[PDB]
C-alpha cells in the first residue's frame, strides 16, 4: 500500500531516486511530425513534443499539427487531451481541436503570467460584450458567465462554428493558486478542484476528452490526470491497494513524454491520491 510506501520514501528522502527510476523506465517513441521545420512556431518548448502515435490531428488539409496528445487509460475508461498553453499564433488551432474532439471542458492549471514571463496566450474573452473571433479557424468564442472563487474560477463559454452556425457550451476550469515555485503545501484545494471538474460531467464518456494544459502540458497537467485515474481505479478494483502510482504514471508516459516534471510533483501526486482515497472510502 502507497501510504506505507510514502512514509518509506519520505523518511529515507528517496524522492529524487524514485523519480530517476521512472525517468529511466519511461517509453521513447518517435516525434517526427513535431520536429518538421514548418511546425517550429507551433511548439512552445523544443524539448516537449507529442509522440506521432498519440498526437491529436487537426482536420485542416494544410497543416494538421498541434502540440497535443491523447492519453487513453483503458482500465479506468478515462481519456484526456494534454496540450501546451496556446501560443499567440495557435489560439485558433486550440479552439479548432476543442471543437473537433467534442470536448466539454478545458482545465487550465497555470496563470497567464508566472515568474514575470507569459506562460500562455490569453485565449478566452475577459468580458461578456467583447467576444473573440479566430479568423484562421472560423470560430467565435463568447464569455457567458464567470464564477470566481478563492482557489479557482469556472467560466461558461459559448463556442460557435461560424461555418455551420452550430454552438456548444464549453466549461473553463481555471486553477489560479498553484505557486510560482514548488507545489501546494496541502492537496485539499487541488482535490476540491478535481471533484468540481468531475461533477460538471466534463470527464464523462458521453463527451470528447477533456483538454488539460499548463505551460508545457506535462507537469501540473500530469499531476491532474494521474490523481484522477488513480482515484477512479481505487473505485473500480476489488483490492484498492493493488493501485501502483508508479505503474499508472509509466502507462501514461507511453502517450506523452515527461508527465510529472519534478520529484516534488511526484510526492504531491502521492499525497493527493492518499488524501483523495479518504473522501472515496
Ligand atoms: C518563430 N520560432 N522560431 C523558432 C522558434 C520559434 C517560436 O516561435 N517558438 C515558440 C514561441 C514563440 C514565443 C514564445 S515561445
Cα-to-chain-centroid distance, residue 207:
16
256 neighbors 51 (Cβ within 8 angstroms): yes
Q: Is 41 in the pocket of ligand 1 (CB under 6 A)?
A: yes
Sign of CA dihedral 209, 123, 165, 144: positive
- CA distance linking residue 139 with residue 176, whole number of Å: 26
Q: Is the CB of 194 under 6 A from ligand 1?
A: no
Q: How far apart are CA 118 and CA 121, in angstroms?
A: 7
The three-class DSSP label of residue 265 is helix
First-to-last C-alpha distance (Å) of the chain: 15
**DSSP, residue by residue, the chain:** -HHHHHHHHHHHT-HHHHHHHHHHHS-----HHHHSGGGGGG-S-TT--B-GGGEEEPS-SS--EEEEEEEEETTTTEEEEEEPPPPTTTHHHHHHHHHHHTB-EEEE-S-SEETTEESS---S-SSTT--EEETTTTEEEEEEEEEE-SSEEEEEEEEEETTTTEEEEEEEEEE----SSS--SSSHHHHHHHHHHHHTTTTSTTSBPEEEESSSSSSHHHHHHHHHHHHHHHHHSSSGGG--HHHHHHHHTTTBTT-S-SHHHHHHHHHHHHHHHHTT-
Using the 8-state DSSP alphabet, how is residue 244 labeled?
A: -
Angle, CA of 268, 257 and 77, to the nearest 5°: 75
87 lines ligand 1 (CB under 6 A): yes
How determined?
X-ray
Cα-Cα-Cα-Cα dihedral sign, residues 127, 90, 262, 209:
positive
Q: Which of 87, 114, 122, 216 to mutate to test the pocket of ligand 1 (most atoms within 8 A of CB)?
A: 87
CB-hemisphere CA count at 13 Å for 81? 30
Bridge partner list, 72: 79
DSSP state of 240: G
CA 70 to CA 255: how far, in whole Å? 7
Q: Are 245 and 270 in contact (CB under 8 A)?
A: yes
Q: State how far the Cα of 83 lies from the Cα of 214, in Å rounded to an integer.
A: 8
Rg value, the chain, Cα:
19
User: Following CA atoms 183, 188, 190, 191 in sequence, which dihedral angle do they give, to the nearest 10 degrees?
Assistant: 140
Pocket test for ligand 1, best of 38, 41, 44, 118 (most atoms within 8 A of CB): 41
CA atoms within 13 A on the CB side of 156: 7
Q: Please report where in the chains the cell 518509506 appears, as a residue.
A: 8
Grid coordinates representing 265? 510533483
Residue with cell 511548439: 43
Amino acid at each position: 500500500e502507497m501510504e506505507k510506501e510514502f512514509e518509506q520514501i519520505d523518511k529515507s528522502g528517496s524522492w529524487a531516486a524514485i523519480y530517476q527510476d521512472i525517468r529511466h523506465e519511461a517509453s521513447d517513441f518517435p516525434s517526427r511530425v513535431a520536429k518538421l521545420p514548418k511546425n517550429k512556431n507551433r511548439n512552445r518548448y523544443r524539448d516537449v513534443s507529442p509522440f506521432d502515435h498519440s498526437r491529436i490531428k487537426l482536420h485542416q488539409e494544410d497543416n494538421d499539427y498541434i502540440n497535443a496528445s491523447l492519453i487513453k487509460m483503458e482500465e479506468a475508461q478515462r481519456s484526456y487531451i494534454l496540450t501546451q498553453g496556446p501560443l499567440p499564433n495557435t489560439v485558433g488551432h486550440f479552439w479548432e481541436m476543442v471543437w473537433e474532439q467534442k470536448s466539454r471542458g478545458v482545465v487550465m492549471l497555470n496563470r497567464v503570467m508566472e515568474k514575470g514571463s507569459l506562460k500562455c496566450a490569453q485565449y478566452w474573452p475577459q468580458k461578456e460584450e467583447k467576444e473573440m473571433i479566430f479568423e484562421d479557424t472560423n470560430l467565435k468564442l463568447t464569455l457567458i458567465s464567470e464564477d470566481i472563487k478563492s482557489y479557482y474560477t469556472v467560466r461558461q463559454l459559448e463556442l460557435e462554428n461560424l461555418t455551420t452556425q452550430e454552438t456548444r457550451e464549453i466549461l473553463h476550469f481555471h486553477y489560479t493558486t498553484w505557486p510560482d515555485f514548488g507545489v501546494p503545501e496541502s492537496p485539499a484545494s487541488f482535490l476540491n478542484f478535481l471533484f468540481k471538474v468531475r461533477e460538471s460531467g466534463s470527464l464523462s464518456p458521453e463527451h470528447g476528452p477533456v483538454v488539460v494544459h499548463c505551460s508545457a502540458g506535462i507537469g501540473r497537467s500530469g499531476t491532474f490526470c494521474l490523481a484522477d485515474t488513480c482515484l477512479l481505479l481505487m473505485d473500480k478494483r476489488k483490492d484498492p491497494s493493488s493501485v501502483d502510482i508508479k505503474k499508472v504514471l509509466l502507462e501514461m508516459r507511453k502517450f506523452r513524454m515527461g508527465l510529472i516534471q519534478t520529484a516534488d510533483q511526484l510526492r504531491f501526486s502521492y499525497l493527493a491520491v492518499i488524501e483523495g482515497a479518504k473522501f472515496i472510502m
